[PDB]
Design a protein around this ligand. Structure first.
Ligand code: ATP
Ligand code: ATP
Ligand code: ATP
Ligand code: MG
Ligand code: MG
Lengths: 229, 337, 290, 305, 130, 250
DNA sequence: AAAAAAAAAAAAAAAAAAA
DNA sequence: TTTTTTT
């Protein structure tokens, strides 16, 4: 809320997330965060909205956003011994807000770095505008705006395999340890549902095939295979 | 008379009400002339009451409270006169009390910003206002009496004196005399003060019965008012018999102060100089613990105290007895009996 | 006459609202209150002005809205269940059916099972919420004793327990619902505040969040993380049902009948069963006992 | 007392080497000396006397008004409110004498201004497109009090004045006034003060052949002469700076860390030697002036103990 | 994330102090004109140098070399001192070296100068250990 | 007049913690006040039964009748009549003291001052609740109010005793409420060992003999009396009977 | 037909700082 | 991490 001095009604100002509303958002350097903003957002992500009432004014705002953030391991480099909770200082509840995790490591291999340097240099020269992707950007946008117009539904076998996979996940990660391992909730099941819907949407199919459920479960599994490695 | 003990405080107040003369030199500018005294002590030891008594006794005085004042609103204000439509300076609180005395309560409970203004008026006794197209210097030669609480609930006698006070030394060194009051718990003193207080609460206004409360009264009969030496009606001042030593009533004391502040301007002599310099050299190199460090400005305080005591006995010259009494009072106020 | 802005949830992000003037004729007086979101059906009319043509140099005209119908839309954004100016009003046959279905056996069972039919389990919460949003009967003994007649409710536990969905349904349910969250509410925001009128040029009172909750419910999310200075200010609102302000020369006492429903998380993000409640939360006796 | 402080005041009133060098490189004749000492040493009174005896002196102290710096005196002054201003400027900073009391009292804005007035650098702060900078060329003389109100047995640079080390190194001469409780000095001080009090004038105890108007004439006379630099002092000052860097080879011994290594030390040495050559003598610079400047620096340094 | 960094450390020596004092005294006791500005502008906007295929081999060899210089046979798990920022920096510096002298394509001398410049500051970037 | 309702830190008074860090008010502010009441909560189930009875009765279904009887039997008066009475008494009367009351007040003040000193020299920290001359003025004003209540133009011993009783209640509840806050404890365990060995269960001994023995030893009188009275305060092995002469080991 | 506004006092929210 | 104080 912003006011000119002795100015009534404390007219609100839109925040970055509020501008990102009704569209895809991007966040960089996510580890550094405002504590008040942090406790606002982690309740905001589930509610997909934020409401702040101050100085005798109140309102409800819309924050329908998709969040994409990048962080950094504490201590410079990711320590392979520990896990995400040990390596990152970021609080426990927010980790369950995110649906997927990706960790990337750099190495001192002589075969990889030469290839990387060749790729980087080979862009300032030769094929400066002749990199080869299978599809052009316009084709990608055409396919995106054609696929976004599909809403998949679920079938009986999908539901059965879904509940079975959920039970397997919940029993598997609860067998590790108590009061130190807590990562599987119902939000994980909803995330897996959403991921299956998205995958089926990619192939432009109005139904769900259990193979999509298998792929989504594999993604969530490797997100927990990675926490151990 | 209703305050028990604190005799040296009463003497200090008496000397302050009729302080020394101002000094101005064609080359030496100006020298401050009056005395300032600060009180710090444990709660409920009759400091505010004595300050109220000083308010009532003195000729011109203004009452201020640390929390109820603003520094900018204390010295001057820029307000527009209604008839002329022009903005003119409005006199502040302590400017109204020029040549008088200003009493401050809850001094340490004041906002620090205002404090700097005090330092200015304690530096050269002049406040300057430069704002909204007005550049003017205002004279303010008043004296300040104030009382403040220690940082804790009660004074800690085992700690550094600077540790017990929230005010910076920059303005604390300005004050000539600093007093520390503590209510030592002794049953004999407890009984004595209990007798005194119980004697006080059994008082009845003359010509009035005890069954009904105090009522409001009418003004004097005349809107305007206005054999000698043989009656001594109020001259002796002893209104009632309670002790062999004499006492004087307030109006006679005020008349004495009025006469003294005008009819005598004493001058010091070399014997008091010798005594004062000897005492200053001794005190500077006594080299033991003391409440506050000493510096060159204490000699000014000795000079002005000797001048005030000469004014008290109505003599045009300062004799060594005043030097002795000033030295004794300073030793009491800084060393302790 | 009253000033009507744009809904902050409707304006495009990072833009500025457009004001209009609404004139309320007889029988519509005082129906609208400051700070609330409303929807008005009216007539659009135009009129001549002098200074408007002066400051622009073109024959511009002013426009005002003559109100003809007003419908409140605060909190209850679910606007598809039924039509009409007031959805909390009943016809006579609806009252008859109320009486008819208020007498069958096990009606309390049906009512408790009919709240949030999309959340599984949590029967105790589904009962406590109903008991909280019905409330008791305020008691006045001889005009010299006052007994509060509303029930507070506090929830607590591990994440993923659908507390926020229950709070949202409560907001959708009650006649007067106010939603707050975490750091997003200040102590002077919930309570009424002192403001200087920018036109009349003196102090005046501004309605706090709890005032809108009078005869209603106030819902707080993330109760534990709210700063304690923002938390201690609602003791009187919970217990005495009164708000008193002595600020800037104004000494007034308001009235607030509000039921507070709060949710939080224990220390460490999980509830340790083998410890008493004193070592699980940071609250103390004065706030817990209420 | 305080003879050497008055000697430094003399050397401040004449000014150092000035009027540039080859290739247009900037050099100033202004000298920056900071007075340091306990309260009740009458450094403020000496500063007032200097302000009285100088024509360009301006006196400032801790707070009391907001128009002292960063704003011209004509801000919103005309009845028509024409916004008359110059932008970044100080009070008569062109060839003025900035006398400051309570150098540890002012806020960050005045501190930024006094860092900007450094080494004859102009003031170019802009607010509304104004860029008419004031040619700041002034000598800085300021008095500050310790944050403890007294000298300390532990190390002085950590005690310091709560001032930046860069600003401290900018100053040409740092001098101390430490109250030493003793008999043979307090006796004389008390005797002089009481004799002043008795006569109500400046007593005949003083023995001064020269008078304030006479000083005001002779200072302008000496500044007018303006002797030029003599080359042969080059080797002597180079070896003096070599031994000063030898001192810097011992400044990690601590117990006082003002024996730092800075070219500004040599520059101030040259400026003070030029001022000593300027106050008297012919159009040359004497080696005795360099020796006197070094002795003055030594006296300034030895006050630490 | 700065491109380069430089450190100045003044330490007391007899010699260097002697030369500094002599230089300062002599100054106190071959340079072009705005020609510089117009030359800079002409290089900035007329000249668009590009790198050649030959310089790629030298660049990758230098990268591999400092990668090796950043590691040893022991299991100390040395920090990866050869970052991609280094490659970007050297590419930009080699382009800058061709920007002057009004050339149109870089030569080896450009890349050797760039790598020596980029490694000189690193050589004095170490802490008290090693 | 100032009336204030305040809560201590940590909610409940938490007697186990010292009074000094249970009250955040400074010494200056408390001195201005002169009646401070520590309202502790207690559980004995008989006061609880009575309070539950009173609350369920004061429920509006019942009390609306019963309170009416208090205006029919003349036991209690209406609020507005009390308002008129207090304003009339404030305007009309203003009592005065008597010399005997002055002497009694002086002696009582000396006694409480001595008790405060004896507590302070033991606890060796400053008392969190002070006693100063303002409290003497407080007792005087309480007596004045008591006399003013009955319109008597003078105050006598009848009001003085009640005033001193109220002041002693309001000072013993707060100031002298366990001034120790819970040689150290080594002599305590040595003391408890010997009496257990020497004195069996069922018999009794004189106080003078025990004091003599443990003053002859290293325990001395100051340590033994406090230890004896705390063993009494334990109230599980030793009982007092027949004035302070008999020490009965139950 | 128009005096209308710089100077104060008091009430907040945000950010940064110290424990 | 929390409360305090300043803008
Ligand atoms: N020596 C004394 N003679 C008479 N009354 C005394 C004496 N000492 C204390 N009192 C009484 O103690 C009370 C304290 O009142 P007062 O507030 O003026 O004291 P104080 O020491 O200035 O306190 P504070 O610092 O809280 O303002 C008064 O009622 C005063 O009569
Ligand atoms: N029976 C159920 N129990 C729990 N959650 C359920 C249930 N049925 C559905 N859910 C889903 O579980 C999720 C739980 O809600 P959400 O993740 O927003 O947080 P919460 O549990 O209310 O609280 P918190 O924000 O404190 O973690 C919702 O998305 C809800 O739709
Ligand atoms: N050497 C001295 N000769 C004469 N008087 C002196 C001397 N030293 C101090 N004084 C006296 O001390 C007073 C001036 O000291 P003062 O405290 O004002 O100066 P300061 O050291 O700048 O400190 P402050 O900031 O406290 O003013 C005068 O009363 C002056 O007579
Ligand atoms: Mg008092
Ligand atoms: Mg000074």
């Amino acid at each position: 809320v912003v006011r000119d001095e002795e100015g009534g009604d404390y007219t609100i100002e839109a925040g970055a997330l509020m501008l990102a509303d009704n569209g895809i958002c991007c966040i960089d350097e996510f580890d550094k965060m405002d504590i008040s903003d942090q406790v606002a957002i982690h309740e905001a992500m589930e509610q997909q909205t934020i409401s702040i009432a101050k100085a005798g004014i109140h309102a409800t705002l819309n924050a329908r956003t998709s969040i994409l953030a990048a962080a950094n391991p504490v201590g410079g480099r990711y320590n392979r011994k520990l896990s995400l909770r040990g390596n990152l200082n970021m609080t426990a509840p927010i980790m369950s807000r995110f649906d997927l995790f990706f960790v990337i490591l750099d190495d001192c291999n002589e075969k990889i770095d030469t290839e990387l340097a060749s790729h980087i240099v080979d862009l300032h020269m030769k094929r400066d505008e002749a990199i080869e992707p299978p599809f052009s950007a316009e084709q990608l946008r055409r396919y995106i705006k054609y696929a976004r117009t599909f809403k998949p539904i679920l079938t009986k076998e999908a539901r059965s395999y879904l509940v079975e996979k959920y039970k397997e996940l919940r029993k598997d990660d609860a067998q590790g340890f108590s009061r130190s391992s807590y990562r599987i909730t119902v939000r994980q099941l909803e995330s897996m549902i959403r991921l299956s819907e998205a995958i089926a949407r990619a192939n432009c199919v109005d139904e769900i095939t259990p193979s999509f459920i298998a792929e989504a479960y594999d993604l969530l599994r490797q997100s927990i295979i990675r926490v151990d490695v | 008379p209703s305050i028990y003990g604190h005799d040296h405080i009463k003497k200090a107040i008496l000397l302050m009400l009729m302080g020394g003369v101002e000094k101005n030199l064609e080359n030496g500018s100006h020298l401050r002339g009056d005395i300032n005294i600060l009180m710090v002590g444990d709660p409920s030891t009759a400091k505010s009451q004595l300050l109220r008594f000083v308010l009532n006794t003195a000729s011109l005085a203004i009452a201020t409270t640390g929390r109820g004042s603003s520094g900018v609103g204390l010295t001057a204000a820029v307000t527009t006169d209604r008839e002329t439509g022009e903005r003119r300076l409005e006199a502040g609180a302590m400017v109204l009390a020029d040549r008088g005395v200003v009493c401050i309560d809850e001094f340490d409970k004041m906002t620090d910003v205002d404090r700097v203004a005090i330092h200015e008026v304690m530096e050269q006794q002049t406040v300057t206002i430069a704002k909204a197209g007005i550049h003017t210097t205002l004279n303010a030669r008043c004296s300040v009496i104030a009382a403040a609480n220690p940082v804790f609930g009660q004074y800690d006698v085992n700690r550094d004196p600077h540790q017990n006070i929230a005010l910076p030394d920059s303005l604390l060194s300005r004050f000539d005399l600093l007093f520390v009051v503590t209510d030592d718990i002794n049953e004999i003193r407890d009984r004595s003060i209990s007798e005194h207080v119980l004697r006080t609460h059994r008082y009845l206004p003359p010509g009035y019965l005890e069954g009904e409360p105090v009522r409001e009264r009418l003004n004097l009969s005349l809107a305007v008012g206005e054999q000698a030496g043989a009656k001594l009606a109020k001259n002796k001042g002893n209104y009632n018999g309670t002790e062999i030593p004499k006492l004087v009533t307030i109006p006679f004391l005020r008349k004495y102060v009025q006469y003294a502040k005008e009819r005598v301007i004493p001058q010091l002599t070399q014997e008091a100089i010798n005594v004062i310099v000897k005492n200053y050299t001794d005190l500077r190199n006594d080299d033991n613990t003391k409440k506050s460090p000493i510096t060159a400005r204490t000699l000014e305080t000795l000079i002005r105290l000797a001048t005030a005591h000469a004014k008290v006995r109505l003599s045009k010259t300062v004799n060594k007895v005043d030097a002795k009494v000033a030295a004794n009072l300073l030793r009491f106020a800084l060393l302790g009996e | 006459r009253v000033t009507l802005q744009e809904a902050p949830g409707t304006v495009p992000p990072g833009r500025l609202p457009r004001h209009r003037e609404v004139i309320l004729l007889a029988d519509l007086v005082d129906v609208s209150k400051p700070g609330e979101e409303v929807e008005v059906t009216g007539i659009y009319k135009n009129n001549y002005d002098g200074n408007l043509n002066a400051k622009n140099g073109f024959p511009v005209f002013a426009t005002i809205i003559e109100a003809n119908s007003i419908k409140r839309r605060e909190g209850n954004t679910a606007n598809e269940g039924e039509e009409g100016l007031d959805v909390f009003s009943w016809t006579e046959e609806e009252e008859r059916e109320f009486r008819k279905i208020s007498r069958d056996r096990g009606i309390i069972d049906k009512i408790i099972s009919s709240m949030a039919p999309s959340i599984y389990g949590h029967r105790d919460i589904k009962t406590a919420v109903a008991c909280s949003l019905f409330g008791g009967v305020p008691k006045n003994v001889n005009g010299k004793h006052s007994i509060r007649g509303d029930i507070n409710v506090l929830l607590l536990g591990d994440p993923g327990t659908a507390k926020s969905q229950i709070l949202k349904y409560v907001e959708k349910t009650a006649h007067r619902a106010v939603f707050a969250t975490g750091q997003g509410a200040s102590a002077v925001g919930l309570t009424a505040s002192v403001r200087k009128d920018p036109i009349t040029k003196e102090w005046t009172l501004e309605g706090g969040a709890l005032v809108l909750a009078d005869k209603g419910v106030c819902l707080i999310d993330e109760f534990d993380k709210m700063n304690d200075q923002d938390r201690t200010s609602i003791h009187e609102a919970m217990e005495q049902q009164s708000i008193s302000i002595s600020k800037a020369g104004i000494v007034t006492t308001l009235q607030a009948r509000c039921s507070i429903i709060a949710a939080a998380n224990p220390n460490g993000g999980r509830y340790n069963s083998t410890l008493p409640l004193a070592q699980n939360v940071s609250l103390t006796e004065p706030i817990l006992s209420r | 007392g305080n003879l050497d402080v008055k000697k430094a005041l003399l050397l401040l009133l004449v000014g150092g080497v000035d009027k540039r060098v080859g290739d247009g490189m900037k050099i100033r004749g202004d000298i920056n000396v900071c007075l340091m000492g306990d309260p009740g040493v009458a450094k403020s009174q000496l500063l007032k006397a200097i302000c009285k005896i100088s024509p360009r002196g301006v006196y400032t102290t801790g707070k009391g008004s907001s128009g002292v710096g960063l704003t011209a005196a004509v801000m919103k002054d005309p009845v028509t409110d024409e916004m008359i201003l110059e932008g970044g400027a100080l009070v008569l900073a062109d060839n003025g004498i900035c006398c400051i009391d309570e150098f540890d009292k002012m806020d960050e804005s005045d501190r930024t201004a006094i860092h900007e007035v450094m080494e004859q650098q102009t003031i170019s702060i802009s607010k509304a497109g104004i860029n008419t900078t004031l040619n700041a060329r002034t000598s800085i003389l300021a008095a500050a009090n310790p944050l403890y109100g007294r000298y300390n047995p532990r190390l002085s640079p950590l005690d310091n004045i709560n001032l930046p080390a860069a600003l401290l190194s900018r100053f040409d001469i740092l001098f101390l006034m430490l109250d030493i409780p003793s008999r043979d000095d307090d006796e004389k001080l008390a005797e002089h003060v009481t004799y002043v009090h008795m006569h109500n004038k400046q007593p005949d105890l003083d023995f001064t052949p020269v008078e304030p108007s006479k000083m005001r004439e002779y200072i302008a006379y000496a500044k007018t002469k303006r002797p030029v630099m003599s080359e042969a002092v080059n080797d002597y000052v180079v070896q003096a700076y070599i031994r000063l860097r030898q001192d810097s080879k011992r400044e990690m011994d601590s117990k006082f860390s003002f024996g730092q290594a800075t070219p500004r030390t040599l520059l101030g040495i040259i400026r003070l030697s030029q001022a000593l050559a300027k106050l008297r003598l012919a159009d040359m610079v004497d080696i005795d002036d360099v020796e006197e400047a070094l002795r003055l620096v030594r006296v300034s340094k030895e006050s630490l103990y | 994330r700065f491109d380069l960094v430089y450190l100045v450390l003044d330490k007391v020596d007899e010699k260097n102090d002697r030369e500094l004092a002599k230089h300062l005294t002599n100054l106190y006791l071959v340079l072009p004109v705005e020609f510089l500005t117009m030359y800079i502008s002409y290089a900035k906007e007329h000249i668009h140098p590009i790198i050649t295929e030959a310089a790629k081999t030298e660049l990758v060899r230098a990268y591999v070399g400092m990668r090796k210089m950043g590691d040893d046979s022991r299991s100390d798990e040395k920090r990866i001192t050869a970052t991609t920022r280094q490659l970007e920096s050297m590419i930009r510096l080699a382009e800058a070296h061709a920007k002057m002298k009004l050339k149109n394509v870089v030569e080896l001398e450009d890349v050797q100068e760039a790598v020596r410049l980029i490694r000189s500051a690193i050589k004095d970037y170490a802490t008290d250990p090693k | 007049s100032v009336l204030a309702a305040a809560n201590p830190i940590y909610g409940r008074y938490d007697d186990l913690k010292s009074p000094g860090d249970n009250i955040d008010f400074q010494t200056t502010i408390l001195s201005r006040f002169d009646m401070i009441f520590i309202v502790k909560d207690d559980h004995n189930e008989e006061r609880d039964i009575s309070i539950a009875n009173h609350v369920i009765n004061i429920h509006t279904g019942n009390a609306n009748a019963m309170q009416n009887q208090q205006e029919e039997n003349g036991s209690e008066i209406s609020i507005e009549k009390m308002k008129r009475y207090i304003t009339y008494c404030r305007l009309k009367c203003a009592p005065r003291l008597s010399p005997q009351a002055a002497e009694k007040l002086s002696s009582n003040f000396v006694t409480i001052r001595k008790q405060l000193l004896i507590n302070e020299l033991e606890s060796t920290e400053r008392s969190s609740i002070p006693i100063t001359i303002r409290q003497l003025e407080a007792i005087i004003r309480i007596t004045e109010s008591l006399a003013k209540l009955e319109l008597s133009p003078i105050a006598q011993e009848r009001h003085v005793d009640e005033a001193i009783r109220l002041f002693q209640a309001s000072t013993m509840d707060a100031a002298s409420q366990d001034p120790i806050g819970g040689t150290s404890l080594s002599e305590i365990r040595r003391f408890e060992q010997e009496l257990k060995r020497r004195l069996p269960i069922g018999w009794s001994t004189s106080y003078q003999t025990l004091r003599r023995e443990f003053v002859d030893t290293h325990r001395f009188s100051q340590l033994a009396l406090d230890k004896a009275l705390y063993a009494l305060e334990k109230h599980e092995t030793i009982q007092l009977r027949h004035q302070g002469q008999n020490i009965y080991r139950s």
